[PDB]
Design a protein around this ligand. Structure first.
Ligand SMILES: [Cu+2]
Lengths: 235, 50, 130
DNA sequence: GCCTTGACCTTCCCCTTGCTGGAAGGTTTAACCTGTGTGCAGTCTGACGCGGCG
DNA sequence: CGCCGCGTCAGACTCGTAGGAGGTTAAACCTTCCAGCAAGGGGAAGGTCAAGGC
């Protein structure tokens, strides 16, 4: 029975090799088609086996087209939405002579705008890093890309300078306050302690710890030492 | 750039438009501004440079 | 049973039934291996009881207790009717105080000129100024 | 500058009705229909290997 | 053995020019997970408003 009906299978797969993916894989899903069609068959009905099989095969492949065929996964529900959308769009094209409007086919479909928006935002596919953007093979699209991710050496050196000036100032304030604030803000280590934990390391206090913070602010506020950061004011 | 003639040059010399060099010797200048105390930092230096 | 057929028979929908089962408000219906909630004539009448219980006024909890009553063939019509009557009383209090509120609203509104004015006497009766 | 000391605020998670809507993910219909292709690609070409073939 | 043919591999450098896609292939029946509403209420954990004792 597998070897009975292979030719209908290829017939349908080539009827649908209107260019979704490729020939052979489709043909092979059709072969699984035929397997499960035969592996459960009701004979009592008295019809031809082949048609029962046929629609089972149709469903198998018409899924597998839509699961794969994009490196992005868009599950099936969105897929048939797009399908019926365009099935309506063709007839809007005729009976308008003109492209559609989101509100009009929203009315005709009876469903709301922002879905159509994000659909058409999502409906489109990726465009191949090495496409020939030049007139000739001048250079492909790769040159026209930025590494907008990593660093600025300017800002890196600027941040080093921030750090230098800051610990230079911390030398200028109280050892207690400066050290306790290096650790309270997590400087000079990996992790950031908090009010009570810094306290009960040091000692039990809570609110005079706050007032030690305000003290250090007054010590820093001090419009003679700001000038190592009065430009980092603008940083 | 495009080139033209200096018919008075001392050949080991070269012609040069400035602003090109102004970009090309930039962080040099930044360091030297910081060194002379004029612009002690880099955005200060850069603002003076602009 | 077929879960949609059951929900249409009781008028509810499936997530309603599921919400009630989450709240432990009926006999547990089994699933099938595919996962279809196996309802029953037992669940039919449990759900119809639990349906009209709140339309009457019995909440999720006391209506679960009513399905307990039904699932209790040892039940006592007394306590049933006593709770029916406690409900009558609570509805009475509700009616009385809602109509007290109504009367206050009507005293406010008929006292208003409705003269499309900045002089809306209602709001200044409501607001603690002046 | 060491201590609370009391008492007030702001944020952030979590909870209490009766559901509702959404998203992602599954499984079956008996009238049928049996070998593509489908637009390439316009033949660049001289030196050089090597398979067959005498 | 000495052709004959087929088959692979090569085909200067540096600047800039334009942004760019397209046509088509079920529907029903089910499953599980969470967002969100009133109208707020508890409650954690940092704080933060005054005020003291040396
Ligand atoms: Cu009024």
């Amino acid at each position: 029975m597998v070897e009975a009906n292979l030719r209908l299978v290829i017939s349908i797969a080539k009827k649908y090799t209107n260019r979704g993916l490729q020939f052979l894989d489709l043909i092979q899903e059709g072969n699984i088609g035929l397997m499960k069609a035969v592996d459960k068959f009701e004979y009592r009905r008295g019809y031809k086996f082949s048609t029962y099989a046929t629609w089972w095969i149709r469903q198998a492949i018409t899924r597998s087209i839509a699961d794969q065929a994009r490196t992005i996964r868009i599950p099936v529900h969105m897929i048939e939405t797009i399908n019926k959308l365009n099935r309506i769009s063709r007839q809007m094209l005729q009976e308008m002579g003109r492209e559609p409007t989101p509100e009009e086919l929203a009315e005709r479909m009876l469903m709301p705008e922002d879905k159509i928006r994000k659909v058409l935002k999502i409906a489109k596919e990726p465009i191949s890093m090495e496409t020939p953007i030049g007139d000739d093979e001048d250079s492909h699209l790769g040159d026209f890309i930025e590494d907008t991710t990593l660093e600025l050496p300017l800002d890196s050196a600027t941040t080093e300078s921030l750090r230098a000036a800051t610990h230079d100032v911390l030398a200028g304030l109280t050892a207690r306050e400066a050290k306790v604030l290096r650790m309270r803000f997590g400087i000079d280590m990996n992790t950031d302690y908090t009010l009570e934990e810094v306290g009960k390391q040091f000692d039990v206090t809570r609110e005079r710890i706050r007032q030690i913070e305000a003290k250090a602010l007054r010590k820093l506020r001090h419009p003679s030492r700001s000038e190592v950061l009065r430009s980092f004011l603008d940083d | 750039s495009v080139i033209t003639v200096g018919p008075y040059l001392r050949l080991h010399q070269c012609g040069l438009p400035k602003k090109m060099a102004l970009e090309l010797f930039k962080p040099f200048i930044y360091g030297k501004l910081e060194l002379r105390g004029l612009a002690t930092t880099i955005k200060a230096a850069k603002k003076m440079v602009e | 049973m077929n879960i949609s057929d059951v929900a249409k028979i009781t008028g509810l929908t499936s997530k309603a039934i599921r919400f009630y089962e989450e709240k432990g408000l009926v006999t547990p219906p089994m699933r099938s291996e595919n996962g279809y909630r196996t309802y029953t004539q037992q669940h039919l009448n449990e759900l119809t009881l639990l349906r009209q219980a709140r339309q009457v006024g019995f909440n999720l909890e006391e209506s679960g207790e009513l399905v307990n009553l039904f699932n209790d063939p040892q039940r006592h019509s007394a306590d049933v009717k006593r709770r029916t009557l406690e409900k009558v009383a609570e509805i009475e209090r509700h009616i009385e105080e809602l109509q007290s509120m109504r009367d206050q609203l009507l005293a406010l509104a008929n006292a208003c000129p409705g003269d499309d004015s900045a002089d809306c006497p209602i709001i200044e009766n409501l607001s603690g100024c002046c």
